[PDB]
Every structure is written in C-alpha cells, then in structure tokens.
Amino acid sequence: MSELEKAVVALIDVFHQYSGREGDKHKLKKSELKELINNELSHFLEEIKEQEVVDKVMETLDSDGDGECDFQEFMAFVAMITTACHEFF
Amino acid sequence: MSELEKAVVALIDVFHQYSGREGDKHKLKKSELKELINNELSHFLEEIKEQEVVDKVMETLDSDGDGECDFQEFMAFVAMITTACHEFFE
Numbered sequence: 156m157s158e159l160e161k162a163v164v165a166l167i168d169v170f171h172q173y174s175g176r177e178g179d180k181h182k183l184k185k186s187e188l189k190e191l192i193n194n195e196l197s198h199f200l201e202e203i204k205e206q207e208v209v210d211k212v213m214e215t216l217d218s219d220g221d222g223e224c225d226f227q228e229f230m231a232f233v234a235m236i237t238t239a240c241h242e243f244f
Numbered sequence: 245m246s247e248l249e250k251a252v253v254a255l256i257d258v259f260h261q262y263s264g265r266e267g268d269k270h271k272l273k274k275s276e277l278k279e280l281i282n283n284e285l286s287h288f289l290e291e292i293k294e295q296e297v298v299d300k301v302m303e304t305l306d307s308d309g310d311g312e313c314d315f316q317e318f319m320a321f322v323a324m325i326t327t328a329c330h331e332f333f334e
C-alpha cells in the first residue's frame with residue numbers, strides 16, 4: 156500500500172478502535188469521542204476535560220441528530236482537522 | 245505522533261507531492277490528479293488510462309468550478325474513497 160492507502164485504512168482502524176468500546180459498536184458516543192480526541196489527537200487538539208466541551212464537539216459533528224458520531228460524521232471531523240492543519244501551514 | 249495524526253499529515257503530504265508538479269503549486273490539474281490516482285491509489289482504484297475518465301473524475305471533484313482540484317476538494321475525494329473502503333471491509 157502507498158502512504159495514502161495506509162492513511163485511508165488508518166482512519167477506518169482508528170474509528171473502530173473507539174466506536175467498538177461501548178454500546179453501538181458502529182458509532183462514537185460522547186465518552187468514546189472524548190477518548191479518541193484526548194488519546195489520538197494530543198498533538199493537534201487541546202485535551203478535553205470538560206463535559207461541556209464534549210457536548211459541543213458532538214453537537215457540531217452529529218449531522219443526523221442521533222446523538223452519536225457515525226463513520227460518515229467522523230470523516231467530516233477528519234476533514235475539518237486535516238483542512239485546519241493544512242491551512243495553518 | 246499517533247496513528248490518526250500520521251494519517252492526517254499523510255493526506256496533506258500526498259496532496260502536496262502532486263499539486264506541486266505543475267502550474268498552481270496548491271492545486272491539482274488534470275495531469276496531476278491522474279498521476280496521484282495511478283501512483284498512490286493503485287491498490288484501490290482502476291488505473292486511469294483515458295482522458296475521458298480523467299475529465300470525468302475532475303468534473304466530479306471540482307466543486308468550485310475552477311477546473312482543478314484544491315485541497316478541500318481533495319479531502320472530499322478522500323472521504324469518498326475511505327467510505328467506499330469502509331463498506332468493503334464491512
């Protein structure tokens with residue numbers, strides 16, 4: 156696999172590392188999303204320690220309004236983070 | 245960096261590697277897009293061997309109508325591919 160193909164597969168891997176921890180194994184509930192952000196984006200995003208900030212991130216991400224973040228919604232999150240990083244540089 | 249962080253920067257790296265070849269260093273023209281797909285997506289997508297196919301992929305990706313694929317448009321392409329790959333592994 157190329158570096159791009161590996162990156163694609165990594166997005167899938169990381170999503171499932173967190174979505175499968177609790178409840179719906181195909182979606183990130185708030186607790187899972189918080190853990191993903193604190194554990195996997197510690198060099199890009201400030202550590203989340205407030206429940207408020209959890210609720211806001213999720214509210215931003217939850218396009219279909221079911222209260223969790225599914226894969227499509229997570230992809231939108233990755234695009235936000237990636238675009239932000241790109242724009243920074 | 246984490247697995248996810250490495251993935252994020254890989255997307256930016258690969259886009260820069262091809263967008264910088266010709267003309268606007270911050271956008272992919274048709275030839276650059278063809279080269280990225282053929283060289284970096286060779287395990288995922290059928291090799292592009294015809295102009296009609298290149299034209300079509302670019303038209304699909306070119307949301308802002310400027311004839312090229314910029315980073316945000318490329319990110320949309322990555323989302324498409326990743327979603328397709330997700331369904332495959334599922």
Ligand SMILES: N=C(N)c1ccc(Oc2ccc(-c3cc4ccc(C(=N)N)cc4[nH]3)cc2)cc1
Pocket residue numbers: 198199200201253254257
């Ligand atoms: N493959 C590459 N191209 C590549 C390789 C290694 C790289 O290392 C870095 C990773 C992350 C950052 C970084 C800047 C920054 C600014 C503000 C904030 C914030 N949230 N206040 C967080 C931030 N994190 C810097 C360098 C970067 C690219």
Ligand SMILES: [Ca+2]
Pocket residue numbers: 173174175176177178179180181182183184187
């Ligand atoms: Ca879950």
Ligand SMILES: [Ca+2]
Pocket residue numbers: 216217218219220221222223224225228
């Ligand atoms: Ca949702």
Ligand SMILES: [Ca+2]
Pocket residue numbers: 262263264265266267268269270271272273276
């Ligand atoms: Ca270019």
Ligand SMILES: [Ca+2]
Pocket residue numbers: 305306307308309310311312313314317
């Ligand atoms: Ca464009």
Ligand SMILES: [Ca+2]
Pocket residue numbers: 308314316
């Ligand atoms: Ca644009």
